Design an enzyme around this catalytic site. Structure first.
Site, PDB file in Angstrom:
ATOM      1  N   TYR A 157       5.135  -2.341  13.588  1.00 36.70           N
ATOM      2  CA  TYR A 157       5.318  -3.782  13.395  1.00 36.70           C
ATOM      3  C   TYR A 157       5.103  -4.099  11.926  1.00 36.70           C
ATOM      4  O   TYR A 157       4.161  -3.618  11.325  1.00 36.70           O
ATOM      5  CB  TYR A 157       4.325  -4.587  14.227  1.00 36.70           C
TER       6      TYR A 157
ATOM      7  N   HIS B 108      -8.150   5.222   3.087  1.00 38.45           N
ATOM      8  CA  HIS B 108      -7.742   3.839   2.744  1.00 38.45           C
ATOM      9  C   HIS B 108      -8.790   3.106   1.876  1.00 38.45           C
ATOM     10  O   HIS B 108      -8.781   1.852   1.882  1.00 38.45           O
ATOM     11  CB  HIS B 108      -7.570   3.052   4.050  1.00 38.45           C
TER      12      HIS B 108
ATOM     13  N   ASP C 146       0.895  -1.175   0.000  1.00 35.95           N
ATOM     14  CA  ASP C 146       0.000   0.000   0.000  1.00 35.95           C
ATOM     15  C   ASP C 146       0.954   1.252   0.000  1.00 35.95           C
ATOM     16  O   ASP C 146       1.741   1.410   0.948  1.00 35.95           O
ATOM     17  CB  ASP C 146      -0.803  -0.061   1.309  1.00 35.95           C
TER      18      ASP C 146
ATOM     19  N   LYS D 134       2.749  -8.707   9.091  1.00 38.19           N
ATOM     20  CA  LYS D 134       1.297  -8.957   8.998  1.00 38.19           C
ATOM     21  C   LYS D 134       0.390  -7.838   8.321  1.00 38.19           C
ATOM     22  O   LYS D 134      -0.813  -7.678   8.575  1.00 38.19           O
ATOM     23  CB  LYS D 134       0.753  -9.398  10.369  1.00 38.19           C
TER      24      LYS D 134
ATOM     25  N   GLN E 108      -5.499 -27.920  -9.996  1.00 39.63           N
ATOM     26  CA  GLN E 108      -5.799 -29.089 -10.883  1.00 39.63           C
ATOM     27  C   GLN E 108      -4.718 -30.189 -10.879  1.00 39.63           C
ATOM     28  O   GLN E 108      -3.617 -29.975 -10.347  1.00 39.63           O
ATOM     29  CB  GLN E 108      -6.042 -28.683 -12.357  1.00 39.63           C
ATOM     30  N   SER E 109      -5.065 -31.370 -11.387  1.00 39.09           N
ATOM     31  CA  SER E 109      -4.074 -32.487 -11.540  1.00 39.09           C
ATOM     32  C   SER E 109      -3.299 -32.912 -10.352  1.00 39.09           C
ATOM     33  O   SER E 109      -2.037 -32.780 -10.365  1.00 39.09           O
ATOM     34  CB  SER E 109      -3.032 -32.183 -12.633  1.00 39.09           C
TER      35      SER E 109
HETATM   36 MG   LIG Z   1      -4.596  -1.944   2.758  1.00 41.08          MG
END
Ligand SMILES: [Mg+2]
Ligand SMILES: [Mg+2]
Ligand SMILES: [Mg+2]
Ligand SMILES: [Mg+2]
Ligand SMILES: [Mg+2]
Lengths: 389, 389, 389, 389, 389
Positions: free
Chosen positions: D229, D18, D11, D232, D242-243
């Site tokens: 921080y 936001h 971001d 996260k 698939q497969s």
């Molecule tokens: Mg965001």
């Protein structure tokens, strides 16, 4: 002390049709078990129906597959049939009593049995279930979820004592073979079998830590008597709860989605299993009257009565689907029943032709002329003009 | 006259599991308090459960924290345990009785207490609440709303007598510290504490105009006994209503949104607090039987009994969630319970690891090999091929 | 003039997985049919997908089962495969092209065909349907309803010209036998066959008054090629409407209940057939882009494009499920999909074991030890202790 | 050929607040990657946002953790920041760019990375996910379900090739330890860790049969930079389908329940993860514009773009939540968002105090006087009269 | 730099009736402001309607209450009226232009103004709102919630920078008195005034920490011109967001409940304020076309356009009610509109007689004979027989 808890169930007459039981039938069964209790045959009992299926729940110390307990339920059903069902010309009077004479074991004679023997715990909570208008594999999905789905039973993940999982005893009722599978490791193979709910049915479940019995579902290999296949008549189910086994609420959570099961009208359709309340529960008279079957002979319904055992005595039962949280589940079931019924006689609302209790295929294939598909192509025009002319 | 109203509550045995209480337990408690009343220990009483929690509501003139009232409830619970729960091998028999001998005060021994002493008003309406399968901070949001949210209690804005607001006594149950906060000025700081419902719990509320007691919620600092944390067992709550305090309807409005609370299955999940009806309320026998806990041992439920006090006598109780307007709130709660349960064992449906009543983390971290994350990166390929081989 | 309308359909590559087609695939097919039209091979065409199935709708005067029309669709699919699907490494590139070389007839090589030849009426409205993630018997219930259910098609009762009913040509795709049944007289026998939607499939329908062709559904007898069963790949369906045949709205009404059909994820589940809108329909470029398959590779969906024929020219197509009245039907289908998916791998949400496209039964029965049920009973205890030890 | 697929996301500015990104930001990033492609740095790319998070999806042959690919995304974000976000004074301009200078690896500098290198299969379908207003453990429940829940992915049970299950690489982001767990055997221990979604996060998943990489989720150990921080921030996720790996529809089914995740307003609440459509997807310009965040800065949303890889080229993207079946899932999410928001600042709608991105606890505990709980009891009356006076 | 943001709004003609604006009206206004911008009168602008109300949003450096900005909007409205509305005989052409000549200030001449001047922040996100078919007190409840309800704006509790609360400037528009109230301390008195939304209207809000302006709502004291009361015409509202002020999402959350507001048909009813999408937003042409008013001339609707300011330039607007989460809020509003409309002409759906824009009370009281209630009682019988005869 070791105690045996046995549920022995039959349909021996409906009122009207397959909608419910006549209340004198439960009253007669309860008075008869009260006499057996006075004579010391059994310790304690509770009599109840769901739809037109009567369950005799009995506690005693004669172990599993006991001739005198099986014979006591046989005679109780015979007598209810003779004295009440035939007297009132009830619909399907004696229907699940399929031999003239008791052989020693009621299993394979029509009635369904679920029983477990175990050392009675310091607290021994158990739940008895009865479902009407379905087959024993109706309980495959709830048994799998309560013992092996961590989205149902949170103790598998957060309870150190349940971390080792469970052993499922799965009966192939077509080829009469037993499989023993253990979860979590074997969950995908187990599902590969029990997803076929008409053939591979969970019959017992054991705790893996010590082998303790955790559940018993009534199911027998298929046999043929008269016109009739026996083994997959409406089931009854016993489950022990708490302390290393799923909590009573984790057991009930496994019924919180009213999944589609086989049975309903003419044993030949699929519809949602509705967790229903009992109309009345009388712990003093040892009798609960369960719900009716109405539209299209259903939808299929399951009742749950919880008990606490003490020296074999059955304190309860308590209706464990009696909560506004389960009204939402009954509302979903009523709406899904209405949705699927608009499908009329087409699969998958009507069952697969090999799983049907009823068919007229015989009579159809005897009246309708088949044409080999190869020759038909060449002559389509002639065939259609013929039909038109 | 000054009167004390005390609710003392415990879970001393369930039927089956944690689903409900055995009705003989309430009958025994009521006969025992009737004898205390005959002897003049208390003025009047009402006995009731919600789920497997029994509340003894008693009115008397011995003040708060009284040895004889606390001891009377202790002995009543001990006797119910010995004579009924152990006799019937009820699940968690005596569970909340955590010492062998009464010390003078029942607080910190397992049972929960909410009590207030006050001059009995010209009309003294009060409401007693009991919630099962949650913690005392479950009442943080409703106590905040009824005393400080003008979208709940219209008297804060339109009643000149309530304009000065309220004093909240907030217990930090981890570091054993009390905070006194006053609304409206301190509402944001108060919320900053009581939003953490597992640690900072509203214990009492007082009217700011004169200090009159308005509510008392049962909560104790955490302590450790045997395996067990005590302080945050299922709560009971007393609220006085009207005349400068919130109207009975403003108090109930604070429960009209069934908010998510901590507890439910194994004290380790979050689910909606459903305002439930009592199954029966018998004002002559002084006994109300509250709702069962079913799917997943819940959802958590709160019952409300309203009373009018006269010379300490309890006229009631009246089930105050018995109204079609609250059916809509129960329907929302049943639907939210079904939605959140599909999350299975993930936060935030499962609680934060420090707030869990149950864990197997210990057993997991003892079987699963950790790799330092730095070295792991270098060797990922080896590690995976090793697991594959 | 006599005109033939043919739909020839295949899945030759998905984008991504089985969710949709790459739009260049439709653009390439449309340019190729535009060249065939310039050369006089066909009169007119329309190219469109539903999910990852592409339909080539072509009008021409070469009759049914024509080598040059079947070969033109073969080559168009081969070329789309070589130039677009293999180029972009699309998922299941060329999947429905199951022989190396064209034999004369595309039927039984993988692609599906529905075609009818008839005298073009003074007004000739027709509807072309394509369903993805199901089998041809998915159209059994709608074909039965539009031609024989008077609760769907009101003209059976109030239109003198439709009173004589219809002739259904039903293919048993297992034993390769054709049945000809006529409604109303034969409705119960017809249902007794076509209710088994995996075996007895309506292939054509004719007006009984004169034999005129009314519908053609794509279905072939089952055969085996490589690992694979062919015959019951996702179907396409042509229906003529009005003037003695059901009105366009009676045809669409037969899809207004989103009934459960077989297919969905891995061709091995049952889920509701949702009548879906096309994302875009461009009548000038002769191309419509149909809906995606998303959750669980579905739910199965059906699109409907209506056309008016003039001298074989296709004026349309018109998206005939584009109406707020069908939003309610899509909403029901989305809700039923969510309900039935909570059943996971159990019948009847998973199909009957003989109807499964996918199985691991083989691998399971090779790892899990069976015990004869007779001997098992005797030794249950040993067997369980063995598993426990 | 071996190919690496990398998503690198940040971001770097919102519009407004936001709620979304400025479209010139995506246009600038796409022109910059187009130049890198012309120079042979990467093979192909796709640029898109969900909320105010921009994802650069790039395919190339430089392997995982490559300095030039990580530096190319660094410079692209720096330039978008300098030329567009700072120019328009966008909210949180450059917010995720947390060092002044590129060190060699973008991981731990603010941006999130999910990347896998593998031999490109004969068909290589993949799905890229981006979620805004949540943490990487938001994908714990869907990753667990698509790789280990047989009620989500039917191939675990009916596909012989998936029977052996998967390996999960779980990062403890607090103590920087990696766990390797294998399903089905280890499912309960795995859940015991990843249920704590803020601490133990699935970072990669591998097929157990051969070790092939199946998914990569963006997550880093927590570190501290400035106030902040990192580790996260809102995640991005790559999954191959698939497969032997889950079908595209089984992957999407794992998002069909909009479960509660942590994040939403101020990174401090829990709300439902809504599977949302893109506003527009332009496969020619290599740009998709994803959904806005509105009420309460959310609810959190996840977008899904599916691609087919050929020699590293990205054919797509295809919006895989664009289906009426997912409207029902968005409708449930909108209703749950409205329900939980009525809880205001209380857990569990507000997060646990250790998991909060925002707190004013500091400022509160500095203004509010605590009383030791022991002494408080003795003096309650004085304390209250003091507050009242 | 200091920047002024002004919204000046009028209704000057509808199309048809009061349902919407003619798009040439917005095009003409935009070309006129583009010329003002070329001449340096203003920095930047955006033109849009909601219903038949046109908003001119302009940014400039001439401060609040500026003659040239107010005169520019006056002339733009006059010219739109003369050249477009009168030309097309639009309904209520020039309706809000209530004097013949501009006096210096547009306030009190009919048009509504909301404006703020402030130092442009490092990021300056703002939201402009326009509501049609209501009064300025329609924004009382959302302004109160976004600045003072901790169940709406979580930053009041968890953001240290917002802990000190806000200052509300409340205009009594009847007695022309201003009140300044501060939250949290004064919240109950504030509500006691602004709950009367027709008389006490929030006009501005300031941050308490530093006095920064946070919002401006368009409202003027009531005056009388011609037949007409002015002051409470449909309002426009500016709000600055983030960094000590509510986040953009907390501002929008305050509109997430579609509360009942006064206005709707004939300015004389109450109905829900629906948060609506714009039909189109064209950031290059500086024009957004807002929603129509349909049933009963409504329901009332509010649109929201978010912008980021840079040196006064308006990057946006962004439709901030465009999210499936707000579809649920529009669905609730559509259902409440249908419910309340069944009340027809009764309070509280029709407004209180003193708050009515329309009345025929005058004409009624002039035709209907009143009887003094005292004498009436004596003679009721005569009076009724008279009416009957
Ligand atoms: Mg965001
Ligand atoms: Mg029956
Ligand atoms: Mg309890
Ligand atoms: Mg297909
Ligand atoms: Mg207007």
């Amino acid at each position: 002390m070791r105690v045996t808890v046995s549920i022995i169930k039959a349909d021996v007459g409906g009122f009207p049709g397959h909608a419910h039981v006549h209340p004198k039938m439960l009253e007669y069964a309860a008075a008869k078990l009260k006499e057996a209790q006075k004579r010391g045959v059994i310790i304690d009992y509770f009599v109840y129906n769901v739809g037109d299926d009567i369950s005799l729940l009995m506690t005693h110390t004669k172990g599993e597959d006991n001739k005198d307990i099986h014979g006591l339920a046989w005679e109780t059903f015979k007598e209810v049939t003779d004295q009440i069902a035939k007297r009132f010309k009830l619909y399907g009077a004696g229907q699940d009593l399929l031999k003239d004479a008791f052989s020693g074991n009621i299993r394979g004679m029509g009635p369904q049995v679920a029983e477990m023997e175990f050392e009675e715990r310091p607290s021994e909570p158990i739940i008895a279930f009865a479902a009407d208008k379905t087959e024993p594999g109706a309980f495959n999905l709830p048994l799998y979820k309560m013992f092996a789905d961590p989205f149902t039973t949170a103790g598998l993940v957060i309870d150190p004592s349940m971390h080792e999982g469970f052993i499922f005893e799965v009966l192939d009722v077509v080829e009469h073979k037993v499989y023993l599978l253990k979860t979590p490791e074997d969950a995908y193979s187990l599902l590969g079998l029990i997803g076929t709910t008409g053939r591979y049915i969970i019959r017992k479940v054991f705790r893996r830590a010590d082998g303790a019995p955790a559940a018993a579902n009534s199911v027998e290999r298929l046999s043929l008597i008269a016109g009739r296949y026996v083994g997959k008549d409406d089931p009854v189910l016993l489950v022990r709860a708490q302390s290393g086994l799923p909590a009573v609420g984790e057991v009930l959570e496994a019924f919180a989605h009213p999944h589609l099961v086989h049975g309903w009208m003419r044993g030949s359709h699929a519809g949602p299993l509705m967790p229903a309340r009992f109309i009345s529960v009388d712990p003093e008279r040892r009798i609960a009257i369960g719900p009716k079957m109405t539209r299209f002979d259903g939808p299929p319904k399951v009742g749950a009565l919880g008990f606490q055992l003490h020296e074999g005595y059955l304190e309860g039962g308590v209706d464990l689907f009696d909560d506004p949280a389960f009204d939402y589940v009954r509302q979903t079931a009523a709406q899904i029943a209405d949705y699927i019924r608009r499908m009329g006689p087409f699969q998958p609302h009507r069952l697969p032709p090999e799983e049907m209790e009823y068919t007229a295929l015989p009579k159809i294939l005897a009246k309708v002329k088949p044409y080999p598909a190869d020759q038909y192509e060449k002559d389509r025009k002639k065939y259609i003009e013929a039909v038109v002319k």
